[PDB]
Symmetry: D2
Subunit: 245 residues, 4 copies
Amino acid sequence: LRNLPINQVGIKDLRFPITLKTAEGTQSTVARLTMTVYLPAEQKGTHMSRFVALMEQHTEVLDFAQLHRLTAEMVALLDSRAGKISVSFPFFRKKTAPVSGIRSLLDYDVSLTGEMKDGAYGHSMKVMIPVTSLCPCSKEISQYGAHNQRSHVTVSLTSDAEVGIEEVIDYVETQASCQLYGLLKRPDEKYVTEKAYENPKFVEDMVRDVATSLIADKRIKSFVVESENFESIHNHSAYAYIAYP
Amino acid sequence: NLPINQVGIKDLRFPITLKTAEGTQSTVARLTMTVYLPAEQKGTHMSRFVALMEQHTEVLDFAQLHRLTAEMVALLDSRAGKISVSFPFFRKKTAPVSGIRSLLDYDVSLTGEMKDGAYGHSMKVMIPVTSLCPCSKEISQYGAHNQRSHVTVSLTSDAEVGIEEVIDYVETQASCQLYGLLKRPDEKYVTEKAYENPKFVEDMVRDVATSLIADKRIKSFVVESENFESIHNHSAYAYIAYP
Amino acid sequence: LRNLPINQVGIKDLRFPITLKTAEGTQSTVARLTMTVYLPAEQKGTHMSRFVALMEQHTEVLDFAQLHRLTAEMVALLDSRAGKISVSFPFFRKKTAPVSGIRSLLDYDVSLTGEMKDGAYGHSMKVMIPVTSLCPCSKEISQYGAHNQRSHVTVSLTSDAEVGIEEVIDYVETQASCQLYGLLKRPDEKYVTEKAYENPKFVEDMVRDVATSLIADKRIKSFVVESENFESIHNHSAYAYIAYP
Amino acid sequence: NLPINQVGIKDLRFPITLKTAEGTQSTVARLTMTVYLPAEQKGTHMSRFVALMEQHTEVLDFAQLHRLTAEMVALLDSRAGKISVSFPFFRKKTAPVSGIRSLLDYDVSLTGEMKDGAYGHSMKVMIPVTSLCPCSKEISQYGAHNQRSHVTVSLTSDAEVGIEEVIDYVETQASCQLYGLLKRPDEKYVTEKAYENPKFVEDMVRDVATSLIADKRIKSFVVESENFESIHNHSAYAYIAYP
Ligand SMILES: [Zn+2]
Ligand SMILES: [Zn+2]
Ligand SMILES: [Zn+2]
Ligand SMILES: [Zn+2]
């Protein structure tokens, strides 16, 4: 009676090397894990070492099928009816400069979550995409130039069928004033400077353009789109978010 | 054409004066200030959030947060919006043997929210405590591993719950609470007290949540605890949400 | 013999409310402190609670005279021949918008250090100043627009006579493509957009212009100037620093 | 007209493969890559630092760092420059009773530096350990407060000192070292061992520094330890520099 069920208990911020397979290829990265299970009112404690045992023994490449298997195996190993695994890591993608064709990596921040509830599995994801934002107000009121800055666009979603990390990346980067590259030659820098100027967007415009795409995707049951613009003229950020439905 | 749930400014740093039941203090806040944006409206008016903060010189407390949130949604011409303010919060404590006084620091957020002329508020408090392991003590012939823990309480009520109240709910339940200033007899007392009161992370979250369930001002809450286990390089963690 | 002196021992990241007085006025802020003393080979340990005792008992406003007194009192209280107090905090200054005249605060990050060595006192400081940087290459090669971004300029210095926090701020902000304001009306935004465009500067130009000023100041015995530009076109930073002499 | 000590790129994130004495692993690095800039030269050539990393596919180790730093100062047409690479580093450990194996994570930086055709290298390793308080144990009738500690070793040598070597120097000296995976008999062993080997932060830094002084490959070093005291909300800290 005095006793209460605990929504989630286990371990948090275990750092662990992982290999990840997505549609575009396989890559090695380093993750932080939070691994937890439901604890019924009657049980005193969970078994904390079994969460680490699980990661040490499962050597398969991570993908959405493997995260499912892993979460199902965890709840079984932990003797629980419910649990979550959240895995956060940097994610690299090969990019090509818009004029030179010179290739370089860009880095994104990703989290993947698997959740079991009484035999039912659900999965969600989050991706932070760094883009260039350029202010339409600045350009319009100014006889020359326009302020611009890096922005972090964060998409969180839950879907029934799998949605690829790269697909979330493309939905955002398609919409940005201009996207980022690690390696830019002189013509590419001329290209990005001009495109961003040509395509100014408020933080409001950015969240709306991405949200439109996500609403259209039949896989997506709910989402949040945030955008944060590190305003180059202020020392605080412009911020917006849309949650759906 | 889509409405935007919230749009405005994030992580504006700003000095504030804060009034609570035990007194007034000066601290430094981060603010996030946002309003609802209707489907066909192009943008909000970003400079007005800063203007509002620059103009209002009054001490912060729950009544002044309400007033600032009202005035914001008015000034921005919106039907809804939210103000969240985060800051370090200091409280004077008394060492348990010497009685020598010293401050402790806690992390607090308060949030006010207007939706179509109705107001709601909520708060969050991170209280650092000592945790000590019952399995370690029971299995070992001497000693018990122990570590700092960060206990985070988020709650929503209608009547005001004081920051100090949330702190007390938690410190009362910890294996032992923290102090900045401890003499040798104080160190002895805290060492023994934690060792006499071992708690798993499970125990800590159940013990705090029971106290909050008993407080009938509280509509809903989350209690989390993260224990920086001194024998691992990762943490034990738990949370309860209610209802 | 087996025993070794310890350069510095004490406490680190004590968070503590402070009141600070500089040339422009007095303000309340929150600091992190690191307070340490020298430990001779022969002594087993220092007295850790006395560092907190010291902060709890000294209720005077902080300024360079008070940091001196505080460091001298610490080494005496700790029974040591040498020690350091480092105090880090956000620092607010009142600013005025360049067209409207509308006033707002801006926030800077500051550290002040006091050091005793056998009766001799020395003090140093560091200030991070967030500014706008605008790329000359971008503007010159582009038919319109120029990429720009927040930059953090960090000045560290040691001096014999006191150098005010605001003076370090002015040395940097005087040199920037354009400086930041919290509150900007439409004409002010037109003003800052244009000024930054009119005054493009590489990270190299920025460190050089600030360093020139610091070399000229007779108070300053040594310094480091760093600048980091959060390139709005990349996901890494452009960075430079000058150390002198 | 002023020369600039170092100019280039900072916190480029980049996946790397790392080879050490115990094996090869894949990790993710932050890089800072800079060159000296002569007084009358206007700017460096920023895109070339990224090109250099994109082109060189070789496994990282001390010989490859030297080679990358040589090639950089060549490609940038500078007389001096520095490459620093920071990453999490994993090592497989054996629990002290069960022998069950599990990884532990450490934070590493390696730095290479060219000055007028001469090369130097240096390294930094943060090793997390358990610390346990001798005063707490001595004064208390039972128990002893203990906590995670972050021990950071920075060193410069000419002959290569392995990352695992620095880790061993430190773990050997801690009240007890950390493991990710511990069974009940392992938890008992580590609890007792720390309690049998209490050390102040002073003790830890002297004990490590003595080991490093004895390693005649080492030209200079700094040992710091920060102990996240489980009875306070602040840390004990010490450092030694040598010579
Ligand atoms: Zn703008
Ligand atoms: Zn335990
Ligand atoms: Zn540029
Ligand atoms: Zn102690």
